[PDB]
Amino acid sequence: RLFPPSADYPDLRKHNNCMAECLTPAIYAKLRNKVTPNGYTLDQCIQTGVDNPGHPFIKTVGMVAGDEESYEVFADLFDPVIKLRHNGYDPRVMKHTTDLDASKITQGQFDEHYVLSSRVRTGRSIRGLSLPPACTRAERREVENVAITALEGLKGDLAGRYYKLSEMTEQDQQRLIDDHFLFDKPVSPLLTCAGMARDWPDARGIWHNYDKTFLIWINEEDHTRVISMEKGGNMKRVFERFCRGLKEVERLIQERGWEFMWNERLGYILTCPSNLGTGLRAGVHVRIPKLSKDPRFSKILENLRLQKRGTGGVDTAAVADVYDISNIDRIGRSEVELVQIVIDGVNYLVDC
Numbered sequence: 390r391l392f393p394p395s396a397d398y399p400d401l402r403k404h405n406n407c408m409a410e411c412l413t414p415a416i417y418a419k420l421r422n423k424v425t426p427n428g429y430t431l432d433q434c435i436q437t438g439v440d441n442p443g444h445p446f447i448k449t450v451g452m453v454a455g456d457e458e459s460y461e462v463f464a465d466l467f468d469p470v471i472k473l474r475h476n477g478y479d480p481r482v483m484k485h486t487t488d489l490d491a492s493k494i495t496q497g498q499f500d501e502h503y504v505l506s507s508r509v510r511t512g513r514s515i516r517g518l519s520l521p522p523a524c525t526r527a528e529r530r531e532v533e534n535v536a537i538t539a540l541e542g543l544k545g546d547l548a549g550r551y552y553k554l555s556e557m558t559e560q561d562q563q564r565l566i567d568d569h570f571l572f573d574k575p576v577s578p579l580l581t582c583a584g585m586a587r588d589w590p591d592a593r594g595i596w597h598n599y600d601k602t603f604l605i606w607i608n609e610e611d612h613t614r615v616i617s618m619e620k621g622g623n624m625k626r627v628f629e630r631f632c633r634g635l636k637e638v639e640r641l642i643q644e645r646g647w648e649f650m651w652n653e654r655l656g657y658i659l660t661c662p663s664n665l666g667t668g669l670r671a672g673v674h675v676r677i678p679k680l681s682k683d684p685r686f687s688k689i690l691e692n693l694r695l696q697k698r699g700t701g702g703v704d705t706a707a708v709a710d711v712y713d714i715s716n717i718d719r720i721g722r723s724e725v726e727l728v729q730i731v732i733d734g735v736n737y738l739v740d741c
């Protein structure tokens with residue numbers, strides 16, 4: 390690079406994201422010239438946190454990984470960012486336990502007068518291929534190809550079809566978005582500034598079973614986003630389908646020699662440090678008219694480990710008091726333990 394490292398130091402005054410709160414002159418100077426084997430840089434990692442000083446509805450991380458090696462090469466920034474975002478989980482000293490045994494959720498039925506729908510998602514990355522911030526068009530097509538091939542192996546109620554977004558009409562896309570089945574077009578500046586809207590919709594698509602109760606998003610926010618959902622509040626069956634579907638998807642992918650990005654410190658590796666560990670967001674849509682307008686609601690959400698979101702997701706506000714309520718933490722606690730903290734965390738919200 391053409392200047393001293395410090396000449397490139399970003400202006401982060403009035404930036405309220407984890408990256409800006411952890412970046413120091415020392416860390417920046419030490420990492421500016423380091424690169425991953427695929428050539429991903431620190432400036433690319435942090436660009437979204439530099440360009441986006443806030444967000445209208447949620448606290449942001451302000452950095453993304455371009456590849457698996459980003460988390461090693463830029464550990465001096467990612468590690469304190471991970472600790473800050475995940476309430477003390479420290480990948481330098483701790484390890485993460487994966488647990489997808491659905492039987493340990495023995496009771497799971499919400500009051501259907503208040504809770505409209507129930508959903509469990511995670512993400513998975515394929516090792517050897519760059520993540521969405523950095524992937525070339527050929528890497529991204531390869532991800533689609535590896536995913537497509539594996540998912541044709543799914544049987545029974547998990548049988549489904551892949552739909553390329555390039556071959557889907559605007560009318561069919563918008564329908565699926567309005568019915569909470571398909572991702573929005575990446576217009577969010579968090580995503581665009583991280584390089585995650587490049588070449589859209591090339592190699593993006595949705596795979597789903599006929600009932601739309603097991604869905605997989607390909608190459609939007611991650612390589613894959615694996616989703617289980619339905620109308621109502623039966624979290625116990627939703628999670629049994631999630632665990633069964635996910636274990637099979639893994640086996641089908643592993644059958645051809647691909648591995649998921651994973652290590653013992655970070656659990657499953659994904660684009661954004663907010664989705665590390667389990668990557669798991671178990672949630673419901675809930676009509677909480679009285680509980681929402683109360684001034685102490687934000688304190689009850691942060692203490693119960695839950696996040697608030699709009700009816701149309703992270704970038705929207707609530708409509709008709711219908712709030713998206715799900716677990717805030719994703720690493721340090723297992724998938725089982727996180728589902729349990731959503732079953733309990735909603736019932737406090739249904740009573741209160």
Ligand SMILES: Nc1ncnc2c1ncn2[C@@H]1O[C@H](COP(=O)(O)OP(=O)(O)O)[C@@H](O)[C@H]1O
Pocket residue numbers: 506507508510566569570571572618670672673674698700701702703704713
């Ligand atoms: N519990 C839920 N029930 C029904 N739809 C949901 C639920 N949670 C999220 N969604 C839908 O998923 C889509 C993406 O929302 P987002 O907040 O980005 O969730 P995620 O990051 O888990 O994909 C939106 O269309 C949103 O309405």
